[PDB]
Amino acid sequence: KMEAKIDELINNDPVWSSQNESLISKPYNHILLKKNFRLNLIVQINRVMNLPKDQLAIVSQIVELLHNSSLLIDDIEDNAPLRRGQTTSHLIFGVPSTINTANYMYFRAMQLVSQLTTKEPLYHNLITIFNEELINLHRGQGLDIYWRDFLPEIIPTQEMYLNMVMNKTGGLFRLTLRLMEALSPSHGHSLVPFINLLGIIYQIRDDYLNLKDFQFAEDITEGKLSFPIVHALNFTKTKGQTEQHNEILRILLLRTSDKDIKLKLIQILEFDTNSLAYTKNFINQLVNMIKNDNENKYLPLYIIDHL
Amino acid sequence: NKMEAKIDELINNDPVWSSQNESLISKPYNHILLKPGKNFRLNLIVQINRVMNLPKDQLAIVSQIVELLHNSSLLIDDIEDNAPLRRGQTTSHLIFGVPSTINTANYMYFRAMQLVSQLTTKEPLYHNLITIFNEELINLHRGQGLDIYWRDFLPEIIPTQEMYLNMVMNKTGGLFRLTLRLMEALSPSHGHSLVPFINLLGIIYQIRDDYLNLKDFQFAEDITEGKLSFPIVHALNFTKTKGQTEQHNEILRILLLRTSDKDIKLKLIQILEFDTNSLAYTKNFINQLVNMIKNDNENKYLPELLYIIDHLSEL
Ligand SMILES: CCCCC/C=C/CC(C/C=C/CCCCC)(P(=O)(O)O)P(=O)(O)O
Ligand SMILES: CCCCC/C=C/CC(C/C=C/CCCCC)(P(=O)(O)O)P(=O)(O)O
Ligand SMILES: [Mg+2]
């Protein structure tokens, strides 16, 4: 009867219950409490693409799974205690379950791609898009983490920083857009260059506000090669400002939560390298590239301000 | 206008990525490759192929896919298990850090995925292969999710033998079925599906892995990890059934210590030895599974194969 139960088990598909499904979904469901704005960007873009609502909703579900899962992983990789003022998933469910659940969701997302179309040519394209951007997202993340964890072995320049962003942040943006463009039953030049720009603006502003809001500035504690930090390191290098250059490095290397020390790094950025003003300006120019796109080379606005 | 011009160029092109960038993020992965077994996993594929007859070009690609998935799963697994060693060498996360190791492992899941396109140009087949890839990776993560949940939230859920076996069908069964199913789908030919057989192989493999981790010690790292192993699942249900309250609680207590103390680990092992007879039970359960194949004279499960089964511990 032992052998009989084994026969039954190996001839059936692996058993999995809704109760099991809920257990593994816990770390994921916790971050859901943190979507209205990203859905808006998708609805807006769909005016140019025109996917039928149902197909649109699946793209949205795919994009929500990747977004949320990648943030669960990112918070573990950044040792972040909070995400939108709430305790991070891994601190509640543990790093092990959270890594597994986030990765599980990548593949659930991958499965939804199959429900976008039954046309084999188009399907293959969609998987190829998914695959390529997840690959880019990972390269970008990998390089960002490498710079941070091997500091001070490599100090990126602005150009290296911008390529890392095109991979990382650009991956998620282009994935949503490229899927939508491949599905369009319609719509002008591709909006990829435009979504790339949005992604870059999004990341620099994210780096900028992390330091500006403090002026918690968790990016400092993390040791991240942020856009303002990249500017300051290369500024001090260039001007031969040895002590300042080394002091930025020292603070980043402390992995500090000390408010006083964080403020000091901010003092260097405000008074010595003027990196926060330089970033504010850099962002404004990226944005004016669109505000001033009268001939619609990028455009097919409100979203670019609430990015 | 030079900035705009550079920005315009940057955004109208694919993201820049160098071979140098590629080597820096491959560190955690290149490191686990320095571990053996590759030959043995290849040996199983080779033997299975005597049935499937995939051309060597294709078989090579199937093997690259499975190897990437295998090694990446292990990198993640060692982080999830807080493992300090793997095949006698330091785990990657301890060298390059957990952050880089998670990213790299996940990166390789997608490289493995990308490779599936190199198996065929036939779109219906392509669709079938990716579906197989997607399904078993979903199964693998479900199984791993349960194994980890049971362990990290113990005693919230004490799995029974049946729950354990289902978890294994999903987790270890996932990787064994992935390889086999890809091959069955690519076969140009050859008898009943080998899925039941490959599930049994995954099950013998897992319970034997659990078994040997304790028997070899009798470093029993599974005890330090607090894993709900086959012998541990038997012990916990055996003691509850027989009303051995103190022994049932002490097993849970030792698991929850996450201890490396050798005497404490030996104490737990000897409890399973003389008190619950979990080592004997497991050993016999393994032999019974193996006998289901060795006594498969009607080739119900079966299509060098037995050789594998005996050196299964080295895949
Ligand atoms: C392979 C994992 C990729 C994770 C990418 C996420 C990064 C998160 C950040 C912000 C990125 C947000 C991307 C939003 C994309 C919306 C579609 P954070 O500030 O929330 O930590 P950062 O670590 O790059 O700064
Ligand atoms: C999503 C990650 C799945 C990881 C599955 C791997 C588990 C590893 C083990 C062994 C599993 C091996 C899978 C079969 C390999 C066949 C070549 P270990 O002993 O190396 O830690 P276990 O945690 O199941 O015991
Ligand atoms: Mg094991």
Query: What molecules are bound to this protein?
Result: (6E,11E)-heptadeca-6,11-diene-9,9-diylbis(phosphonic acid), magnesium ion
Task: Tell me the structural class of chain A.
Answer: mainly alpha
Strand content of chain A: under 5%
**Can you count the beta strands of chain A?**
2
According to CATH, the fold-level topology of chain A is Farnesyl Diphosphate Synthase
What is the rounded distance between the termini of chain A? 62 Å
The CATH superfamily of chain A turns out to be Farnesyl Diphosphate Synthase
Rg over C-alpha atoms of chain A, rounded to the nearest angstrom: 22 Å
Instruction: Please estimate the helix content of chain A.
Output: over 70%
PDB class: transferase/transferase inhibitor
Keywords: prenyltransferase, transferase
Assembly: dimeric
Entry title: S. cerevisiae geranylgeranyl pyrophosphate synthase in complex with magnesium and BPH-sc01
